[PDB]
Paper text:
The [name] ([name]) protein is a conserved cell polarity regulator with anti-tumorigenic properties. [name] is an important regulator of cell polarity and acts as a scaffolding protein to mediate a diverse set of cellular signalling pathways via its four [name] domains.
To understand the interactions of [name] [name] domain interactions with [name] PBM sequences in more detail we determined crystal structures of [name] PDZ3:[name]_CTN complexes as well as a structure of [name] PDZ3 apo. Unexpectedly, when determining the crystal structure of the [name] PDZ3:[name]_CTN complex we observed a heterotrimer with a 2 : 1 stoichiometry comprising only a single [name]_CTN chain. The complex of [name] PDZ3:[name]_CTN revealed an unexpected stoichiometry, where a single [name]_CTN peptide was bound in an antiparallel manner in the canonical [name] binding groove of a single [name] PDZ3 molecule (Chain A), with a second [name] PDZ3 molecule (Chain B) engaging the same peptide via its β2 strand. In this 2:1 complex an extended β-sheet between Chain A β2-[name]_CTN-Chain B β2 is formed. Examination of the [name] PDZ3 molecule engaging [name]_CTN using the canonical ligand binding groove reveals that eight hydrogen bonds are formed upon binding, including a double bond between Ser3412NS5–Ile1018PDZ3, and single bonds with Ile3414NS5–Leu1014PDZ3, Ile3414NS5–Gly1015PDZ3, Ile3414NS5–Leu1016PDZ3, Glu3410NS5–Gln1072PDZ3 and Ile3409NS5–His1023PDZ3 as well as Ser3412NS5–His1071PDZ3. The non-canonical interaction between a second [name] PDZ3 domain and [name]_CTN involves two hydrogen bonds with Ile3413NS5–Leu1016PDZ3 and Ser3412NS5–Ile1018PDZ3, as well as a single bond between Glu3410NS5–Ser1039PDZ3 at β3 and Ser3411NS5–His1071PDZ3. Interesting, Glu3410NS5 is able to contact Gln1072PDZ3 whereas in the PDZ3: β-PIX complex the equivalent Asp642β-PIX is too short to reach Gln1072PDZ3. The Ser1039PDZ3–Glu643β-PIX interaction is recapitulated in a more unconventional configuration, with the Ser1039PDZ3 being provided by chain B which binds [name] in a non-canonical manner. Previously [name] PDZ3 had only been shown to form 1 : 1 heterodimers with PBM peptides via the canonical [name] binding groove. Examination of the [name] PDZ3:[name]_CTN interaction using ITC demonstrated a 1 : 1 stoichiometry, suggesting that the binding of the second protomer in a non-canonical manner is likely due to crystallographic packing and not biologically relevant.
Numbering used by the authors:
A (entry chain B): 11 to 20, 23 to 34, 37 to 40, 43 to 53, 60 to 91, 94 to 102
B (entry chain C): 53 to 58
C (entry chain A): 11 to 20, 23 to 34, 37 to 41, 43 to 91, 94 to 102
């Protein structure tokens, strides 16, 4: 399914792999590889960030979108 | 290629 | 050169990339600072994009996996040694 996940910024650490310029997840997508040991799950595909499409973004484009000065993530899992 | 945002 | 950077505990406004499990930095197992927000905490602490993180509170991360390096940085000020330039 596809879920909108809201995360308050102050929840600690997010790791991602993938991207279009290119692991066991998925795809051309960007995928959550880790979350500090809420709502998000490893393997989640990240579709949008704060309403901005990242479905086809490069890895560095995804990173820059995650690295924002609340964070909203649209994700697909499974 | 893996990045982390903290 | 090799610099000692004091970095607050994690947000910090930085991304790191790399590790021994394998970007434009180095070239190469290292963990690097790939982006810093201009007024974020990492920037103010003196970290720089392109910095290769060598150690974190005594933990040698020169040959660490990406997630080893991150865990180190997220253990609950950090003393970082970085190689740059």
């Amino acid at each position: 399914s596809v879920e909108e996940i809201r995360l308050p910024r102050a929840p600690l650490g997010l790791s991602i792999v993938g991207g279009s310029d290119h692991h066991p997840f998925g795809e051309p997508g960007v995928f959550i590889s880790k979350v500090l040991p809420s709502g998000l799950r490893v393997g989640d595909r990240i579709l949008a960030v704060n309403g901005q499409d990242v479905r086809d973004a490069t890895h560095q484009e995804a990173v820059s979108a995650l690295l924002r000065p609340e964070l909203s993530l649209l994700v697909r899992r499974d | 290629l893996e990045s982390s945002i903290i």
